[PDB]
Amino acid sequence: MSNSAIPLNVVAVQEPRLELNNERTWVVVKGGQQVTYYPFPSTSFSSNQFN
Amino acid sequence: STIGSMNISFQQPSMYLGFVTPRLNIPIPPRITYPYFKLSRYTTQFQNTLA
After folding, report:
1. CB B13 within 8 A of CB A43
2. What is the C-alpha to C-alpha distance for residues A38 and B22, in angstroms, rounded to an integer?
3. What pairs make up the disulfide bonds (chain A)?
4. Which is the most buried residue in B8, B11, B42, B51, by most CB within 10 A?
5. Nearest CA distance, A36 vs chain B (angstrom)
6. CA angle, B16 as apex, B31 and B20 as ends, to 5°?
7. Taking chain A, what is the end-to-end CA distance rounded to the nearest angstrom?
8. DSSP assignment of B1-51
């Protein structure tokens, strides 16, 4: 690593097929209860407008 | 008459008002007094009709 010109820093990486260890943390996904959809039919529709 | 009869609608009506916040340096009283009038009606029908 420190072979060339200005020396560099070493790091190693495990290939994808194997870690096999790293720290595996269970992650509970949470979002607020009650997601609801409304259909607001336009008041005062026209032929040249929508409101 | 030519007209009889007629049909009237309304759509959602907005209302327009104007909030003016004031300058930090000048302070505005904690309690304050406004002049307010209050109007009432009294009707009394009479007979007979005049023509």
Report:
1. no
2. 39
3. none
4. B11
5. 23
6. 40
7. 67
8. -----------------------SSS---SS----------------S---
Euclidean distance between CA atoms B9 and A43, whole angstroms: 11
Among positive and negative, which fits the CA dihedral B26, B30, B35, B36? positive
* Residues in CB range of A12: below 8 A, 6 or more apart: none
- CA dihedral sign, ordered B19, B25, B26, B29: positive
B11 lies within 8 A of chain A by CB: yes
User: Reported resolution in A?
Assistant: 3.5
**Chain A contact for B43, CB < 8 A?**
no
